[PDB]
């Protein structure tokens, strides 16, 4: 959807300039997600696998090999907690690529996490009331 694209490039953004890189609507989505990221980050993070160490993305990377590293992330269904983990993880991508200058990857990396929540995650998302649900647990 235009909406989960344009959340995924906010979010990507936010991680870039927040990890010392260049980074070239629903204000409290975007707000309340960029939050629950750096929440995600500082709190929950370590407790789980890098799944950074599993991707080792270059200009070869498909999304099919993305897609499976994430299903590992959602094993055991979803929730708006492994939801942040998967922007977060993108997040992380992207600032390894911009450190291996392979800025190419990062709009990729923003292609393939909108891919993935089309497939995967929009009808969760849909049935358990909306990035507007999310912004009343998490905001
Ligand atoms: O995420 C993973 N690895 C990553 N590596 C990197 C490397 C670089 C950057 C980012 C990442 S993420 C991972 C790997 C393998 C398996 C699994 C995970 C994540 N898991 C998670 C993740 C979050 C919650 C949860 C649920 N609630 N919360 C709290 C809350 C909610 C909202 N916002 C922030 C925190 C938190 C739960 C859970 O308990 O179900 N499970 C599910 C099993």
Same mark, same amino acid.
């Given at each position: 959807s235009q909406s989960n694209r344009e959340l995924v490039v906010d979010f990507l953004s936010y991680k870039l300039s927040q990890k010392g890189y260049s980074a070239s609507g629903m204000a409290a989505v975007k707000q309340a997600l960029r939050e629950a990221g750096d929440e995600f980050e500082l %709190?929950? %993070? %370590?407790?789980?696998?890098?799944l950074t160490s599993q991707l080792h993305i270059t200009?070869?990377?498909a999304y099919q090999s993305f897609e499976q590293v994430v299903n590992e992330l959602f094993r055991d269904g979803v929730n708006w907690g492994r939801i942040v983990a998967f922007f977060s993880f993108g997040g992380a991508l992207c600032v390894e690529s911009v450190d291996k200058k392979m800025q190419v990857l990062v709009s990729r990396i923003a292609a393939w996490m909108a891919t993935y929540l089309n497939d995967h995650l929009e009808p969760w998302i849909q049935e358990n009331g909306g990035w507007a649900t999310f912004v009343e647990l998490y905001g």
């Open positions: %709190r929950y %993070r %370590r407790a789980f696998s890098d200009p070869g990377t």
